């Protein structure tokens with residue numbers, strides 16, 4: 001399967017910076033969502049789940065085709081709760097009907113991270129919508145109730161290595177688990193709509209307790225009111241993972257730099273970019289624009 005990036009006709013940096021600003025302006029406006037967390041965390045989760053279907057072996061799945069717009073992927077049990085990120089973006093797609101679905105879902109994730117004061121993420125245009133029959137089947141996204149060997153093995157399919165996996169998981173400092181979506185409940189920290197390295201700090205400094213929640217699932221709970229998933233706590237159980245966790249709890253700039261590279265790579269897996277294709281765009285935030 002080859003998927004070649006095709007820039008939307010005649011579009012350039014300024015067009016996509018207009019779509020960025022539209023998403024970012026609505027993130028500021030619709031602030032009440034999920035008890036004032038706002039839409040940013042569900043939008044970086046949506047960009048991860050449309051990319052996380054990729055399989056390196058046959059180049060199926062991935063962010064290129066925008067296939068989450070089809071019922072099979074929209075109704076995947078693993079995507080429960082992401083309909084709220086879709087409905088947030090649907091106004092903006094009506095306003096810029098020329099951007100492809102893959103591009104709009106991935107730029108929403110980029111915009112949310114930078115607007116929640118994360119690192120800049122280089123983003124590239126050119127994903128092309130593909131037919132309903134290209135939609136990957138349910139079951140390619142990871143279970144939460146498993147251990148470190150499962151996480152390592154699952155992420156080899158998206159060929160991410162240990163460092164990349166640990167840098168990507170730092171995004172679980174954002175938002176929260178919702179019992180009616182996943183059977184898990186609670187936030188992982190106090191700053192859950194500002195991008196920081198707090199996931200790593202909480203993992204190493206809190207007093208975790210294995211408890212059973214109302215959906216009868218086990219999760220790691222702390223006195224402070226935070227929770228960690230079994231696959232999250234996995235990172236301090238494995239010796240290779242645990243020493244990268246310590247590296248990111250001791251250096252927030254290295255965390256930001258490595259997250260930026262692994263999230264771009266995540267979003268680009270499966271796509272062939274021609275050598276005459278434009279460079280990756282670095283978008284300015286509303287704040288850097290005085291907007």
Ligand code: HEM
Nearest residue numbers: 041042045048081142143144168171175176177178181182
């Ligand atoms: C083995 C890996 C992973 C598993 C099992 C997993 C699982 C989960 C689960 C069960 C939730 C709760 C969903 C809900 O109830 O609403 C969640 C939320 C979230 N995850 Fe993951 N995740 C994984 C990796 C990642 C990665 C790599 C990213 C992003 C780079 C990510 C970003 C998020 C975000 C931002 C949320 C919060 C959503 C919200 O607030 O609504 N996840 N994760």
Ligand SMILES: Cc1csc[n+]1C
Nearest residue numbers: 172175176177187188
């Ligand atoms: C807050 C959250 C959602 S999924 C994992 N964590 C830590």
